[PDB]
Design a protein around this motif. Structure first.
Motif, PDB file in Angstrom:
ATOM      1  N   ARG A 139      -7.893  -3.881  -9.400  1.00 16.87           N
ATOM      2  CA  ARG A 139      -8.760  -4.375  -8.424  1.00 16.87           C
ATOM      3  C   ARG A 139      -7.809  -4.505  -7.138  1.00 16.87           C
ATOM      4  NH1 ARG A 139     -11.537 -10.750  -8.146  1.00 16.87           N
ATOM      5  NH2 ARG A 139     -12.203 -10.465  -6.035  1.00 16.87           N
ATOM      6  N   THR A 140      -6.747  -4.786  -7.167  1.00 15.47           N
ATOM      7  CA  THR A 140      -5.511  -4.980  -6.104  1.00 15.47           C
ATOM      8  C   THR A 140      -5.341  -3.412  -5.485  1.00 15.47           C
ATOM      9  OG1 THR A 140      -4.547  -6.494  -7.084  1.00 15.47           O
ATOM     10  CG2 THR A 140      -3.502  -5.852  -5.396  1.00 15.47           C
TER      11      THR A 140
ATOM     12  N   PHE B 288      -7.509  -0.883  -5.895  1.00 19.75           N
ATOM     13  CA  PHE B 288      -8.658  -0.422  -5.247  1.00 19.75           C
ATOM     14  C   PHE B 288      -9.218  -1.038  -3.976  1.00 19.75           C
ATOM     15  CE2 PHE B 288     -10.200   1.599  -9.380  1.00 19.75           C
ATOM     16  CZ  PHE B 288     -10.217   3.130  -8.787  1.00 19.75           C
ATOM     17  N   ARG B 289      -8.392  -2.025  -3.766  1.00 19.31           N
ATOM     18  CA  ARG B 289      -8.534  -2.818  -2.302  1.00 19.31           C
ATOM     19  C   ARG B 289      -7.745  -1.823  -1.340  1.00 19.31           C
ATOM     20  NH1 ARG B 289      -4.741  -7.072  -1.480  1.00 19.31           N
ATOM     21  NH2 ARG B 289      -5.229  -7.874   0.872  1.00 19.31           N
ATOM     22  N   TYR B 290      -6.835  -1.043  -1.769  1.00 22.10           N
ATOM     23  CA  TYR B 290      -5.952  -0.087  -0.704  1.00 22.10           C
ATOM     24  C   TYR B 290      -6.512   1.264  -0.817  1.00 22.10           C
ATOM     25  CZ  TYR B 290      -2.732  -4.342  -0.613  1.00 22.10           C
ATOM     26  OH  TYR B 290      -2.333  -5.693  -0.286  1.00 22.10           O
TER      27      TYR B 290
ATOM     28  N   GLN C 238       0.657  -1.250   0.006  1.00 24.76           N
ATOM     29  CA  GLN C 238       0.125   0.049   0.105  1.00 24.76           C
ATOM     30  C   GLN C 238       0.983   1.428   0.162  1.00 24.76           C
ATOM     31  OE1 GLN C 238      -3.536   0.425   2.636  1.00 24.76           O
ATOM     32  NE2 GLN C 238      -3.584   2.677   2.184  1.00 24.76           N
TER      33      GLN C 238
END
Lengths: 193, 193
Positions: free
Chosen positions: A42-43, A45-47, A9
């Motif tokens: 996707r990875t 927008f997870r963070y 992140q």
């Protein structure tokens, strides 16, 4: 701070900031930050919920360190000294991390959409200050005194950073300390012989 | 303030605020404010660039009064007293105007899109404070001390208003005065025996 080993992140944040600085904030898409970071959107927008979050990094983790610091300071210590220590530490970077932190604060303080978005980040920061002051006074964080202090401490931080961005030759820690000295002394003597 | 005879612009603002309060901000369109105001949307957009401006009214005119007040105060008067007088006066309304002003500040402090938008309004307010402090110190408005003071004075204003919105039984002028007293004294003695 820049102290601990980099996470996914905080590494996305850093490549993002470098992108935004080189190409401009509005010119860089969230997909460029993702690809530049070697991850899927996707990875990413997870963070981060948005593009405007990317410069702030993992601010929740930063806020949890400040809060634990304030809560771990011995209670035989004046409240103002607690406030000063936190102000100075949590804006303190190694010489190594200055260029990147200056990049970060450049975006946050001068891109109007990030200035707008950062009111909610600053509110969480102020709440940590109000919570600390409230416990020490044995009072509530939504009371007037703790709330006012949170706002006054934010004011010295904001001033210091604006001043620091405006002039390379100035030291952030020195500016924060001058600002804090004025909050410590109070404005009674301002301009006075 | 609510002192002077109402203008078309400040009358649009007032009907707007009453609409937004009764129906909700996002539920009210700029066309409803126009029609409720007996004007065309062209006439409205002449006075406001956006929906988010409507609650702020003619803030430029307010800012010009504060600035002239600060500039008309005799220079044999301490800077802090200047700052206090302005803080207290320019948030001072007749009993008559309280309900409407409380409506205004309710929107501005608690609708997130208005919180975001109001950073630019607050910046102009702070610049008036920095300009005054700079002249009195014989210095520049973009220097550290004037900038810091502008931010600290804004902090007492923001705290007072949040406190005031949170509790009907409290007086804004009293809250502003407590907040200002703390800025006057400084935080050295905070929580101290």
């Amino acid at each position: 701070i820049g102290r601990r080993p980099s996470t996914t992140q905080d590494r996305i944040s850093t490549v993002g900031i470098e992108l935004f600085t080189e190409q401009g904030f509005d010119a860089t898409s969230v997909d460029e930050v993702a690809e530049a970071s070697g991850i899927a959107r996707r990875t990413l927008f997870r963070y981060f919920p948005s593009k405007n979050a990317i410069p702030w990094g993992d601010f929740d983790a930063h806020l949890a360190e400040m809060r634990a610091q304030l809560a771990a300071q011995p209670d035989d210590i004046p409240i103002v000294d607690g406030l000063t220590a936190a102000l100075l530490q949590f804006n303190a970077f190694p010489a190594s991390e200055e260029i990147n932190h200056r990049k970060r604060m450049g975006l946050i303080l001068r891109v109007p959409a990030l200035q707008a978005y950062s009111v909610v980040m600053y509110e969480g920061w102020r709440n940590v200050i109000a919570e600390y002051v409230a416990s020490r006074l044995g009072t509530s964080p939504t009371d007037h005194v703790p709330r006012t202090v949170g706002y006054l401490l934010l004011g010295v931080a904001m001033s210091a950073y604006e001043q620091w961005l405006d002039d390379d030759s100035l030291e952030l820690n020195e500016l924060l300390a001058s600002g804090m000295q004025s909050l410590y002394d109070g404005l009674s003597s301002l301009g006075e012989p």
